[PDB]
């Protein structure tokens, strides 16, 4: 039934190996794994995307409090949030406290505002050309943020591992990123 | 839709900073909040009434335990529950279990019993004589109880706040309740 | 509603201290319980066979690991499992993932398959022989499943507990068990 939904493409095709919309699965159980899909791969990509801003030697001018800790002098990944030298836990309190106003008031659906599929945040307010895109074109940018939340779900994963392993005495040279410094 | 619901009234009128309510929000959603709030109005209501009679040098009578710890030797607030010299910890775990009994088997909302309004946990079992009210002074009640649990929910938060920040440093002449030892 | 349901069987007949099925009980909140019921007594009839082969002596032959750990070598119960000498936390680990890929994938009642109560997860797969007895004995079989794992919970509740006193001094002999080592 909902074999022919989005993200059911080559060359997989459809793929459900441990068979969450097997049998009469309703629409509002793909609708809720649908949404729980597109909002972890949005986090991870922007996960993703912050790992190699950060790795890539690049940091926000200035410092992160008024004691005078440069923002460029914080490890990278887990260590950055996590560990003896990381930012300050207030900071990360803080961000966690954005996050959850953002999900809260701002990154939701809210009901009756126009929202034509799920995932679908803008609610009337925000809108930077989601009509231009004929009926191809708008299915074709879906499916491309989907994917990219896959692989980015998968590359995080995969990032915060290598960078936990590295203690334990695992430190490959990854193909692209080199030593996971 | 909810903005002449009870709780908008002067002079914020109907505050909804969040957005909980915009868009087509479902009478369910409202109810399920204002059922949170009204719980939490009430547990923080007794809360800070027993903070204030604990405060204010009244203790039961005798010892908590066989050992003869008097209830009149333990600290005041958080530290009374969580902390190197507390009520015994089976004293605590007794408590939540208590609790934990009375709210899935007596402080709940059984259906098919007469409950007029969300919060009402009558059950038709005990009554002071609510149907002797008219229907503004229904309203009135209602109103004043939600109010009184914001504010007591406030209260409470700073009492605990304030509790935990003097051994940091930060230990004000607080108002009406002097210094909070 | 539900006194004539399954589990409401003699001596106690109907039995609903809590008042969980009080009022106009919907069959959708019975169902749940039912099912977590079921769910529980299921894995505590498990847990008390595996504690029973266990401390009976009958242990699989070979390693748990490549470093030579036998299987007879570790204690009975939560010992087992969390201690400092227990089977390894991979292990552990391991069993807690084909656990969560059995609840999520094969331990579960697919809609639209055919299955006939609560707690049936045929699902038209594995079958050995239900529609062989008649309605009668379909009942029995299902109460005398539910009434075991009922006692199940108790007994593996009971073997935890008096594993867990043995070490603060109580250490009783048991009936038919005897001492718990
Ligand atoms: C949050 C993670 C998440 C979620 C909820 C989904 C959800 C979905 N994916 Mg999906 N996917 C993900 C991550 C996720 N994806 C990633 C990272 C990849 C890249 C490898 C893919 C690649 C992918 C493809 C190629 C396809 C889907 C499809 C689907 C849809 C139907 C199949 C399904 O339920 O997924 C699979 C089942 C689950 C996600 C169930 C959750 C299982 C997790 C792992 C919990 C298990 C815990 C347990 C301890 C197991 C751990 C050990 C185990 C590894 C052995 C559904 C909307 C299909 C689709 O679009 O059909 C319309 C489809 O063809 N996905
Ligand atoms: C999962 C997302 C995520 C998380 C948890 C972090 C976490 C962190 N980042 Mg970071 N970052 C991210 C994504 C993320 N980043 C992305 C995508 C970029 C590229 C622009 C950066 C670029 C970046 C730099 C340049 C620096 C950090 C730094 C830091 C650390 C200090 C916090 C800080 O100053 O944030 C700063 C955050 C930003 C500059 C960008 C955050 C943008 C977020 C992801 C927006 C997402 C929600 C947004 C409101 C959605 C809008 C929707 C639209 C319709 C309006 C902290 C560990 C600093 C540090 O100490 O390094 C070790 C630092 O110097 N980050
Ligand atoms: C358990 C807490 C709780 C809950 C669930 C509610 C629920 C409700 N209140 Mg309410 N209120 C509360 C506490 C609470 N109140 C307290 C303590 C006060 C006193 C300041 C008030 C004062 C108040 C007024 C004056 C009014 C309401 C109204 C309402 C209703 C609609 C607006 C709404 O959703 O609330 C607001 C939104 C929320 C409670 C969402 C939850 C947000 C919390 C903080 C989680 C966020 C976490 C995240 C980390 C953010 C933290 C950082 C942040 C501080 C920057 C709704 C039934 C309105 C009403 O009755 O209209 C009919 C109305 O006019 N409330
Ligand atoms: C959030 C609620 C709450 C919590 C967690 C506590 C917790 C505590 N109180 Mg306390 N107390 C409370 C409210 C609360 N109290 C109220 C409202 C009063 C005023 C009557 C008191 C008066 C009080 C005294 C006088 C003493 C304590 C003490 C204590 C401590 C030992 C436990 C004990 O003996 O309780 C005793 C609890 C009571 C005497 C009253 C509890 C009443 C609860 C809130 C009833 C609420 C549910 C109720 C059944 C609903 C009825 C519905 C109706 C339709 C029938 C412990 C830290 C003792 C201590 O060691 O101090 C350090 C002590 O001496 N409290
Ligand atoms: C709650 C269930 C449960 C749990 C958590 C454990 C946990 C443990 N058992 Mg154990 N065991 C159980 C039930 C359980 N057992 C049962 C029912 C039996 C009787 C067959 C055994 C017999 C047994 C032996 C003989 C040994 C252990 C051992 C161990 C330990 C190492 C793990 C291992 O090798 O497992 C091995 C597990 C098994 C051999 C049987 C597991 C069977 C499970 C319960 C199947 C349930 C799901 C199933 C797929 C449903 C099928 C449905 C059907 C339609 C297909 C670990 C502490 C070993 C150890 O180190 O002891 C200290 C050891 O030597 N167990
Ligand atoms: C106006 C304003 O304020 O905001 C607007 C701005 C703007 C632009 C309009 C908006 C937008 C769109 C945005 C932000 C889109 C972002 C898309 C984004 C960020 C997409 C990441 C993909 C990452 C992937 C696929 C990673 C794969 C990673 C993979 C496949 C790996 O395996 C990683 C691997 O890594 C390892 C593990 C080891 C290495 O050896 C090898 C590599 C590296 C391969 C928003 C949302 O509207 C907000
Ligand atoms: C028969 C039986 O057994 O039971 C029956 C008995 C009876 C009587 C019939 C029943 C009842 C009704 C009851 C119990 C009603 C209780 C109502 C109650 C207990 C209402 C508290 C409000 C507290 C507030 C508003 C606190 C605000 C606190 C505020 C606004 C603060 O900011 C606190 C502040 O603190 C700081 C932070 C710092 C200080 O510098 C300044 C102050 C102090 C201002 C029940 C429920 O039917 C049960
Ligand atoms: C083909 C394949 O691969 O699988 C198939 C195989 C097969 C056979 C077909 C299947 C099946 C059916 C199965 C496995 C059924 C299993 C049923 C099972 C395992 C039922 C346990 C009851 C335990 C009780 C009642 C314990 C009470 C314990 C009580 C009442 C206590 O108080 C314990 C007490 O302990 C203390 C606390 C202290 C002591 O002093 C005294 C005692 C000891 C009394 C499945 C499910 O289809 C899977
Ligand atoms: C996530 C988004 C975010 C938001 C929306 C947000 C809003 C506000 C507002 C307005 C409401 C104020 C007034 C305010 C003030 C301060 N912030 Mg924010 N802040 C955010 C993030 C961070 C992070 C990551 C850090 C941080 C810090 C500080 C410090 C330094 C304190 C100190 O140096 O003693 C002060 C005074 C740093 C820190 O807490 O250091 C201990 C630090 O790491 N903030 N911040
Ligand atoms: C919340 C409501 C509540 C209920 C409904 C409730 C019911 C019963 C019943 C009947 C079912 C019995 C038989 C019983 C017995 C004991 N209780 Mg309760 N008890 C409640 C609360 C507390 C608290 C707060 C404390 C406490 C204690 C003890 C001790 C002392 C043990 C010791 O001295 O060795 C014993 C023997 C104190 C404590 O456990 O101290 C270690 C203590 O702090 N109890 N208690
Ligand atoms: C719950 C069911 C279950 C499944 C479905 C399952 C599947 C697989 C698969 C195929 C996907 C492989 C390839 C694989 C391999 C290894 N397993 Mg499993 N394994 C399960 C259970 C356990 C337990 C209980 C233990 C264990 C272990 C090991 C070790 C030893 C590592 C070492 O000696 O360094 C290796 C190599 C032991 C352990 O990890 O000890 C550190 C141990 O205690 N496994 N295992």
């Keep these: 039934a909902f074999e022919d939904e989005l993200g059911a493409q080559p060359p997989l095709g459809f793929f459900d190996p441990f068979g969450m ?17 597109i909002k972890h791969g949005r986090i991870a990509q922007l996960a993703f995307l ?18 005078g800790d440069s923002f460029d002098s914080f ?11 990381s930012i300050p836990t207030a900071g990360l309190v803080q961000i966690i406290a954005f996050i959850g106003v953002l999900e809260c008031a701002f990154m939701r659906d809210v009901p009756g505002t126009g ?16 009509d231009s895109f004929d009926e191809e074109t708008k299915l074709q940018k879906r499916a491309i943020e989907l994917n990219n939340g896959r692989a980015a779900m ?8 290598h960078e936990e392993i590295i203690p334990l005495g695992y430190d490959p040279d ?3 990123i080199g030593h996971l410094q």
């Design 115 to 130: 929202n034509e599929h799920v995932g679908d945040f803008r609610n009337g307010y925000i809108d930077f050309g989601w």
């Design 154 to 161: 998968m590359g995080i994963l995969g990032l915060m591992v």
């Design 75 to 85: 490890p990278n990944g887990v260590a950055a949030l996590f560990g003896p030298n």
């Design 50 to 67: 912050g790992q190699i801003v950060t790795r890539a030697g690049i940091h926000l001018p200035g410092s992160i409090n008024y004691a």
């Design 21 to 37: 919309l097997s049998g009469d699965c309703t629409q509002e159980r793909f609708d809720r794994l649908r949404y729980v899909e």
């Design 174 to 176: 990854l193909p692209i």
